[PDB]
Design brief:
part of a larger assembly; 6 chains; A mainly alpha; B mainly alpha; C mainly alpha; D alpha+beta; E mainly alpha; F mainly alpha; D: alpha+beta; 3-stranded antiparallel sheet; 24% helix; 25% strand; E: mainly alpha; 57% helix; binds cardiolipin; binds 1,2-diacyl-SN-glycero-3-phosphocholine; electron transport; cytochrome c oxidase; mitochondrial carrier
């Protein structure tokens, strides 16, 4: 399988940057209401957890969607904080893709039919994602605070009208630029886990489906569904803890729980909610992951195949 | 030991199973002794007496809506209680049977994900066998492809010889007789290209 | 205070504010009108009154005028009978064939 | 779906809710008839108000609409057998379709013969009437029906007949014509059926014309002035000349 | 990579087998344009006929509530002429024709295109029957799911259009036609006004699509001995198969449309919590688990059958005529069907 | 007919069809005794229909092939059999679908989680007419309790008849 790779065309840095920015802008614009619903579902069950039983376990995404719509802001109410979300996502992708491209170009094998093993690429992707998430933690924090407010009491809300406005308010009120990096280690852990939980499961099932059913067209999409499931299983606890740390107010009075760090948040989640309290909003997180990944993979594959056909690559090399 | 998070009234995040509206398996005693059934009147048949009343006509089609009575919900197990009651203190508990009937081992239902696994058991078993074990062989379930031109050898796949046979006097006459179907492919460059009406996939590239 | 779950605390209220009507102002006005005028306001689909060649329906017509015979019925308590006495006569020819 | 506002839907919901609330099972009625004589109920507390033999007085076999179809059957069978039209294999079988569906109207007619009333009794209390009918194969059916279910039809049976003013009994008291009566809900053999039409044939004995007229006109008859006749004349499954 | 996941495309050496003609082989006419065109054509024709049928039936019922039903054939002809003369009938024809175009180009056409796209390549056995039809069960199912909510916005736009028509003058949107309402609703009440609480419509569309298409394809292949071994018309047989499939689809789709009646039309018990909590899905589950199957089939023909069944029947007939149910059958011994010709004739 | 597919059809009809249908009859007859809950009717009916149809469709063409001289244990056969063989294989897959439904109903039986009620109401035999009276009274009370929350005949007919609320022109 180490001879099985197909890297006869390597996109340049400009191509990867532009394509990533555009395609991921589209993907993030499509699934932002799903992310909003997931964050709200995680917020509403902080000290409570999952209290239903059997098939009712968890929080219904459609119920949260209906409540947020019945608020009265319509679908535009699901895109509040989208400026912060988009800027943070684009900055994270820029930094991660630049670092990954540099370290890959320094380390990729000579032969076009060879590539780094999933462990080496996983190390590179984890380092890149950790760095990019550490640098974009202020934007992620502003976005999560914008989403979380609304499911919180009036005196507990921050009232952010933008990304720069939120950053200025955080720096001025809480104090210092270290305030912008509240819960940044949680974001680093989430990005490290997310960057290693998707490439592994996808290639596994994709190649196994090929071995079983030959070269059909549904193989990559079934593998994408499987990879999305396993990435959601691995990443959701870290996303939950990051949401808890981001949404915590500076005043200890204005908090259902007070967390002094990542470990403290995990401990107080296990104490009050149990283990199953980590996986709240799993359906929303998995659906958003699958839709985002499908949109990105589909559009990127179309564009890159069009580029390859103009580069003279043969059909089996595309 | 009251936790409002476990209370369906205070905690609005506890979704209600409407099919278990009147049934609380937590309060089921073992053996069951509750009486939830009795005579029901004044729904369509009044409990009053109008047999000889000439000024009163009974119209049961005017029946009023009442609270729907759901089918009884089966008992749900209590893990700690069941483990404690069925636990035996080996070598210090007498091997005997208690006089009370509450010592009976009552069966209570439990989780449903196990039965989710059970429901897909035929699919999982057939998939396991045929796909996972790759039975009868690897190539059976794969999407069918013809071999490339003269692959692996002309002794097995004599595509060029058949192409020449169909394009000669004898081949043309045999096709004219109607007992032989027309040629199903064309050798363009060094590639065997099957016609659309042939109803087969194209051969895979020799990578 | 909070974290004492013997009594509910307002810090655990998962209630979202109501900024505006969910589906616009006219939807709310129609909902108010429905609340006030459910049953008092009855629109009537338009049918001409005096049409030549048609006998106006002054009263209900018997079952003698029915073109088709129902094979299903209703019990007086709402139960829907699928297996009715008409169904036996209807099933005789199919079973015979 | 419910967020769409329809005034007709709101009116329907209001009508259903108002009918559920205001309209009750127990309905007050003022249709009460007091007969001018003492009613002599039998040993079982019911007075026979109508008797007949509907099967004896009906044409069973040679009825016009159905003899036509049953006489057309041999023509289709012959057309299939000899194929005078030189049809293909499917068309002759299409010809053979007809004999399977030509006796069905006779089946419906013979079924209708069992909805002609054979006996009608008025039970004590004046609110229930027992109706006995018989099928063409000798099966006997009994149905207890409330008096208010009866709605007289006209002579032609095309339209409903006006209650409180209708003359289906002659001056003497016997039936003037074959009277059709519609029942809103008839429980036949344990299955409730809506809008069932029954017939009282002219060649039938109407005992107690007042009680028969009151039952047909949907009256609650006052049976306070009664006596009981201890006559054990009848037997179960008694022969009745069909 | 371009994001957290890399789609690792790989190269593989060739493989081949003895036979080539009974698995998935995509047909040459299965392009997106051709499937869309054929599905849209069949859908718009079937929908136009179905909506004209519905308008005629409901305007006949509207006239019959104010005039006596005809006694003989001449009175029936006069009644039909007066129904056609109705002002209410012509506007209904126009608006339901617009609705039929919308649901044919985007719902029935989409269903047909998706079914053909997913199921074009399933080839059939040469002189037998397609024994492995189970492979079509997931495939067809996917299509149904992928096309389940494609009719919901149009149906809810029609509902909103008529609801607007039935309100007082001061509380009217002034919708000139169905297309005007469809174009104006998403910018006045929002896009979610066309999707909120649409589980009955979605599951009804799912069952209609799956039952109709799967049953029709299965029967038109498995009941093929009726006109191949014992020579029958095959057109009467196709019509009978289409009727059976349509009846099964209508039977399996109706009970989910009763949830509307059960939830917000059945009178409520005062002072008691509302059953089903106004969800349509708790109601659907209760119907699924209800012991008496006749209670949720009341009004099957009054409310639903004659508003969907002719449309589904014509959809099947026209789809088969255009060619959306044709599958490739190739001899498995001679020619392209075999890679071991030496055992073909021995 | 010795050592031909006629024997295969005979004993497969018998064993598979009859024996497994009786086994399924016992499974549904003892479902509460075996599982503690009552079974679901929908997937049970689907299981019945598909299993029976599969048995017939799979084992009648085997009779046809046995009459034509088809030996039993040959994996290759004359070309003139394939037709019915295909039909036979089709039937088997139909049977398989029924099997799926079987397992589905078991899953569906544990989502449902209902307590089973015997249809006899405790009166298996009407040896006397008093038993018939007791059964009739209890049955009517049970059915009345079941038909609660389901509207009466008049309201139901009103809702069904007045369903259509889409008219273009009003007065
Ligand atoms: C039923 C009866 C019992 C089972 C019988 C099984 C019979 C078959 C069998 O054994 O086949 C051999 C088969 C291995 O052969 P194979 O199928 O060729 O595998 C390919 C290789 O793995 C080579 O492929 P691979 O190495 O690429 O596959 C692994 C790959 C692809 O794997 C997959 O796609 C599937 C698994 C993905 C998991 C990802 C999330 C993990 C989360 C935690 C889970 C715990 O997964 C990853 O790369 C993982 C990346 C993401 C996770 C990163 C680390 C964790 C992050 C933090 C998570 C925190 C979560 C909690 C909070 O399975 C086993 O050997 C396992 C047998 C287990 C049962 C027997 C031993 C019991 C011991 C007690
Ligand atoms: C080639 C064949 C070889 C056969 C022998 C090889 C060794 C065994 C291999 C297969 C192991 C699983 C067998 C399951 C079926 C047989 C046992 C049985 O009927 O138990 C009745 C017992 C009755 O439960 P219930 O009536 O629902 O409510 C009772 C309450 O739980 C309250 O009752 P409780 O207090 O007793 O509850 C304790 C326990 C219930 O206890 C069990 O579940 C015992 C399971 C081990 C049985 C060991 C004896 C050998 C049985 C072999 C049967 C042939 C294989 C069938 C499965 C093949 C595919 C794996 O339930 C739990 O702890 C809840 C979660 C259970 C998760 C699933 C079991 C682990 O459990 C079941 O019926 C559930 C299982 C039904 C089959 C579907 C799931 C199969 C396993 C999927 C993967 C799980 C990881
Ligand atoms: C291809 C070959 C297949 C072969 C199969 C096996 C053949 C033999 C056995 C027969 C099996 C027939 C097949 C099943 C039929 C249906 C079962 C049934 O109970 O139906 C009636 C049942 C309604 O009755 P119910 O609910 O039981 O009763 C309460 C009702 O209020 C209704 O209250 P009710 O009291 O008014 O009605 C009671 C109901 C009761 O229902 C039935 O009885 C159904 C079965 C009737 C046929 C029985 C044939 C027996 C043949 C025997 C041959 C000789 C041996 O009766 C009727 O509905 C009409 C009368 C039917 C005849 C009654 C007498 C039956 C036995 C006659 C023979 C007995 C003596 C034999 C003597 C032999 C001497 C040698 O259901 C329906 O009408 C509709 C069902 C619901 C559909 C919802 C669909 C939703 C969507 C999801 C679908 C599922 C998921 C998958 C989706 C995707 C699919 C692709
Ligand atoms: C798990 C699930 C398992 C499911 C297994 C299968 C279950 C099947 C039944 C499930 C549902 C049962 C309940 C139900 O349907 O309730 C509704 C309905 C009650 O609704 P409703 O609210 O009372 O209706 C209001 C109406 O005002 C009053 O309505 P009604 O009470 O008078 O009832 C009407 C009913 C009354 O019908 C009967 O009673 C029929 C006689 C049944 C006898 C008993 C069964 C004998 C079976 C023998 C063999 C098996 C043993 O009429 C029909 O059934 C007619 C169906 C026509 C279908 C047409 C489909 C094609 C459309 C296009 C046609 C034009 C094609 C050419 C176009 C050319 C253009 C160029 O049911 C009934 O009243 C009857 C109960 C069931 C009777 C037997 C059902 C099977 C017969 C099927 C016949 C058609 C087959 C296909 C023919 C295709 C020809 C092309
Ligand atoms: C900065 C922090 C970087 C941490 C990087 C950890 C290793 C990479 C992530 C795991 C991964 O992608 O595994 C794929 C690899 C894929 O295997 P591979 O890399 O040998 O390539 C696949 C080869 N085939 C499929 C042909 C056999 O999977 C494993 O190694 C599975 C076992 C380990 C899985 C868990 C590793 C956790 C490490 C600590 C995380 C914290
Ligand atoms: C670790 C503990 C076991 C896994 C979590 C179990 C649990 O309660 O999950 C609830 C959550 C609930 O998800 P949810 O919070 O999105 O709610 C959707 C669920 N409904 C709609 C039914 C209310 O379910 C999962 O996480 C399922 C996947 C489990 C993955 C790990 C195995
Ligand atoms: C560690 C856990 C391991 C678990 C085991 C491995 C995974 C098991 C779960 C698999 C889930 C199902 C995936 C199906 C994907 C199908 C995609 C596709 O188009 O496949 C084409 C294949 C082949 O279709 P075909 O007819 O073109 O191919 C026949 C072979 N040739 C090419 C020579 C003509 O379709 C199928 O296999 C049918 C799948 C239907 C769904 C049921 C799947 C399970 C049963 C499969 C065996 C066949 C019997 C089916 C009937 C009985 C079912 C009980
Ligand atoms: C599955 C889709 C099938 C479609 C089939 C074909 C349909 C054809 C007819 C379509 C009709 C509707 C077209 C609307 C086009 C846009 C119109 C417009 O600009 O409207 C103004 C609206 C904004 O107005 P508004 O919503 O504020 O409404 C104004 C009116 N008030 C305020 C009174 C309510 O524009 C948008 O909403 C566009 C922003 C992008 C929306 C993206 C939605 C993504 C949803 C993801 C899934 C749901 C969340 C997750 C839930 C589950 C979680 C697990």
């Amino acid at each position: 399988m180490n001879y099985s790779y197909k890297r006869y065309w390597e996109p340049s840095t400009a191509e990867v940057i532009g394509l990533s920015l555009s395609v991921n802008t589209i993907s993030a614009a499509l699934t932002y209401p799903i992310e909003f619903v997931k964050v709200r579902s995680q917020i509403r069950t902080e000290g409570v957890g999952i209290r239903s039983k059997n098939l009712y376990m968890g929080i219904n995404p459609n119920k949260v969607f209906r409540e947020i719509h019945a608020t009265g802001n319509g679908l535009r109410g699901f895109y509040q904080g989208f400026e912060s979300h988009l800027i943070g996502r684009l900055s994270y992708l820029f930094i991660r893709n630049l670092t990954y491209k540099i370290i890959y170009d320094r380390t990729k094998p000579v032969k076009a039919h060879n590539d780094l093993s999933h462990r080496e690429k996983g190390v590179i992707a984890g380092f890149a994602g950790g760095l990019a998430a550490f640098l974009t933690s202020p934007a992620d924090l502003v976005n999560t605070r914008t989403i979380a407010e609304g499911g919180k009491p009036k005196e507990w809300r921050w009232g952010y009208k933008g990304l720069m406005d939120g950053i200025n308010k955080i720096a001025a009120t809480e104090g210092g630029n270290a305030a912008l990096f509240r819960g940044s280690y949680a974001n680093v852990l989430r990005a490290v886990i997310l960057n290693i939980s998707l490439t592994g499961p996808f290639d596994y099932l994709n190649e196994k489906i090929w071995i079983t059913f030959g070269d059909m067209t549904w193989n990559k999409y079934a593998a994408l569904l499987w990879a999305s499931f396993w990435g959601s299983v691995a990443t959701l606890p870290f996303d939950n803890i990051r949401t808890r740390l981001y949404a915590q107010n500076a005043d200890p009075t204005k908090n259902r729980l007070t967390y002094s760090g990542w470990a403290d948040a995990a401990k107080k989640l296990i104490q009050h909610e149990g283990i199953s309290g980590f996986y709240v909003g799993f359906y929303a997180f998995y659906i958003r992951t699958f839709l985002y990944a499908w949109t990105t993979v589909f559009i990127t594959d179309k564009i890159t195949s069009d580029w390859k056909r103009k580069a003279g690559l043969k059909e089996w090399q595309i | 030991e009251y936790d409002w998070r476990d209370d369906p009234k205070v905690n609005k995040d506890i979704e209600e199973d409407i099919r278990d509206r009147g049934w609380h398996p937590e309060t089921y005693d073992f053996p069951y002794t509750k009486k939830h059934d009795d005579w029901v009147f004044d729904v369509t048949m009044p409990s009053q007496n109008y047999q000889t009343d000439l000024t009163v006509n009974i119209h049961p089609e005017n029946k009023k809506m009442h609270v729907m009575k759901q089918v009884m919900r089966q008992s749900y197990w209590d893990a700690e209680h069941d483990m404690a009651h069925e636990y035996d203190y080996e070598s210090e508990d007498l091997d005997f049977q208690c006089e009370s009937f509450k010592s009976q081992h009552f069966r209570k239902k439990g989780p449903i994900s196990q039965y989710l696994i059970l429901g897909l058991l035929p699919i999982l078993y057939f998939g396991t066998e045929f796909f996972y074990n790759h039975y009868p062989d690897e190539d059976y379930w794969r999407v069918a492809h013809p071999p490339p031109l003269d692959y692996p050898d002309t002794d097995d796949t004599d595509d060029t010889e058949t192409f020449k046979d169909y394009k000669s006097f004898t081949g043309r006459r045999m096709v004219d007789t109607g007992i032989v179907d027309p040629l199903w492919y064309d050798i363009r460059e060094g590639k065997k290209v099957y016609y659309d009406w042939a109803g087969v996939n194209q051969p895979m590239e020799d990578i | 205070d909070q974290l004492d779950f013997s009594h509910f605390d307002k810090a655990f209220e998962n209630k979202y504010d109501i900024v505006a009507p969910e589906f616009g102002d006219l939807h709310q006005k129609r909902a108010e009108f429905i609340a006030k005028n459910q049953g008092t306001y009855r629109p009537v689909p338009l049918v001409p009154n005096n049409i030549k060649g048609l006998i106006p329906k002054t009263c209900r017509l018997p079952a003698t005028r029915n073109w088709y015979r129902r094979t299903s019925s209703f019990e007086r308590n709402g139960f829907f009978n699928i297996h009715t006495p008409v169904l036996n006569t209807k099933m005789i020819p199919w079973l015979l064939f | 779906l419910n967020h769409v506002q329809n005034m007709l839907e709101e009116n329907l919901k209001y009508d259903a809710q108002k009918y559920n609330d205001e309209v009750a099972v127990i309905q007050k009625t003022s249709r009460i008839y007091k007969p001018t004589y003492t009613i002599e109920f039998n040993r079982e507390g019911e007075v026979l108000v109508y008797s007949a033999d509907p099967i004896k007085n009906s044409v069973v076999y040679f009825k016009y609409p159905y003899v036509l179809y049953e006489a057309a059957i041999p023509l289709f069978i012959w057309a299939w057998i000899y194929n005078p039209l030189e049809l293909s294999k499917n068309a002759v079988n299409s010809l053979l379709i007809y004999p399977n569906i030509a006796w069905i109207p006779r089946m419906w007619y013979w079924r209708s013969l069992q909805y002609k009333i054979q006996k009608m009794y008025l039970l004590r209390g004046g609110k229930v009437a027992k109706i006995e009918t018989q099928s063409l194969a000798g099966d006997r059916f009994t149905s207890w029906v409330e008096t208010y279910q009866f709605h007289p039809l006209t002579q032609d049976q095309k339209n409903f007949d006006n209650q409180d003013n209708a003359e289906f009994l002659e001056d003497e008291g016997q039936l003037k014509y074959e009277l059709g009566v519609q029942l809103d809900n008839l429980q036949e053999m344990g299955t409730t059926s809506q809008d069932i039409v029954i017939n009282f044939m002219k060649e039938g004995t109407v005992h107690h014309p007042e009680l028969f007229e009151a039952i047909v006109k949907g009256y609650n008859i006052d049976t306070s002035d009664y006596v009981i006749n201890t006559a054990n004349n009848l037997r179960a499954r008694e022969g009745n000349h069909n | 990579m371009f994001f957290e996941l890399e789609d690792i495309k790989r190269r593989h050496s060739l493989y081949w087998d003895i036979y080539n003609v009974q698995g998935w082989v995509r047909r040459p006419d299965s392009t997106l344009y051709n499937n869309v065109k054929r599905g849209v054509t069949a859908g718009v024709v079937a929908s136009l006929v179905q909506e004209n049928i519905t308008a005629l039936v409901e305007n006949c019922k509207l006239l019959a509530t104010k005039y006596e039903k005809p006694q003989n054939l001449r009175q029936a002809a006069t009644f039909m002429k007066e129904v056609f003369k109705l002002e209410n009938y012509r506007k209904a024809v126009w608006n339901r024709s617009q609705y039929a175009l919308c649901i044919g180009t985007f719902d029935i056409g989409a269903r047909l295109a998706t079914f053909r796209w997913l199921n074009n390549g399933w080839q059939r056995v040469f002189a037998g029957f397609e024994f492995n039809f189970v492979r079509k069960i997931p495939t067809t199912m996917l299509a149904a799911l992928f096309t389940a909510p494609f009719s919901v916005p149009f149906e809810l736009a029609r509902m909103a259009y008529y609801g607007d028509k039935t309100f007082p003058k001061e509380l009217q949107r002034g919708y000139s036609s169905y297309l005007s309402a469809l174009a104006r609703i998403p910018f006045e009440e929002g896009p979610y006004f066309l999707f909120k609480n649409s589980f009955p419509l979605i599951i009804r569309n799912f069952f209609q699509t799956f039952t109709l298409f799967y049953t029709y394809d299965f029967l038109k292949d498995k009941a093929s001995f009726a006109w191949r071994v014992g020579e029958q018309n095959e057109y009467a047989c196709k019509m009978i198969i289409a009727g059976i499939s349509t009846y099964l689809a209508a039977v399996f789709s109706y009970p989910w449309m009763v949830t509307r009646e059960m939830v917000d039309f059945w009178p409520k018990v005062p002072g008691a919590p509302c059953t089903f909590n106004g969800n349509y899905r708790k109601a659907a589950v209760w119907i699924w688990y209800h012991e008496f199957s006749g209670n949720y089939f009341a009004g099957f023909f009054t409310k639903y059958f004659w508003k969907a069944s002719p449309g589904m029947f014509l959809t099947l007939m026209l789809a088969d005529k255009v060619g959306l149910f044709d599958q490739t059958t190739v001899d498995n011994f001679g020619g392209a069907g075999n890679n071991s010709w030496e055992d073909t004739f021995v | 007919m010795h050592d031909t597919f006629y024997v295969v059809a005979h004993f497969h009809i018998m064993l598979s069809g009859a024996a497994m249908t009786g086994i399924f009859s016992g499974i549904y007859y003892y479902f509460n005794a075996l599982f503690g809950v009552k079974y679901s009717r929908m997937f049970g009916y689907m299981h019945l229909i598909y299993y029976s149809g599969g048995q017939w469709v799979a084992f009648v063409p085997l009779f046809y092939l046995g009459f034509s001289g088809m030996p039993r244990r040959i994996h290759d056969y004359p070309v003139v059999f394939m037709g019915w063989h295909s039909m036979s294989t089709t039937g088997h897959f139909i049977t398989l679908v029924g099997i799926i439904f079987f397992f589905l109903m078991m899953f569906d039986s544990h989502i449902e989680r209902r307590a089973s009620t015997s249809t006899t109401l405790g009166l298996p035999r009407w040896y006397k007419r008093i038993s018939y009276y007791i059964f009739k009274i209890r049955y009517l009370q049970h059915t009345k309790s079941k038909m609660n929350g389901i509207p009466g005949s008049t309201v139901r007919l009103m809702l069904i008849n007045r369903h259509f609320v889409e008219y273009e022109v009003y007065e």
